[PDB]
Amino acid sequence: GPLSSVKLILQGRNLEVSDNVRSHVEDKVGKSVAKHSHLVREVDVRLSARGGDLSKGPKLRRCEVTLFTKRHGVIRAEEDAESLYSSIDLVSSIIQRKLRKIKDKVSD
């Protein structure tokens, strides 16, 4: 969310965040919810990672994105993928369907 958009809030758990990470966050999330015309209040993007070489369990990168919008409720999407980038793109797709669910349900 570079300008004019919903307020971005990152959470980094078990993960040192970089330039490419949060840059990929605001560009993929923000620039895929850039054709929005939505005054969504708050986006909480909580980007944790787990397992593989870090600890026990498979390599996981798990993102939850929550939108506290005015427009008919709150929404959240959690996806767990092999990379950060596949996580954030996949949640980007899910939140595209949830926001088209909201905009398309405002009809008549």
User: Rule CB under 7 A: which residues touch RNA?
Assistant: 7, 9, 39, 41-42, 57, 70
Q: Look-up: residue for tokens 């929404």?
A: 75
Of 85, 49, 87, 94, the closest CA to residue 67 belongs to 94
Q: Which amino acid is at 31?
A: K
Structure token digits, residue 71: 């427009």
Determine how many CB atoms are found less than 10 A away from the CB of residue 18: 11
CB-nearer residue toward RNA: 62 or 95: 62
CB-nearer residue toward RNA: 41 or 59: 41
Find the shortest distance in angstroms from Cβ 71 to RNA.
9
Find the shortest distance in angstroms from Cβ 56 to RNA.
8
Do residues 76 and 94 touch, judged by C-beta distance below 8 A? no
CB-nearer residue toward RNA: 69 or 92: 69
Find the shortest distance in angstroms from Cβ 68 to RNA.
8
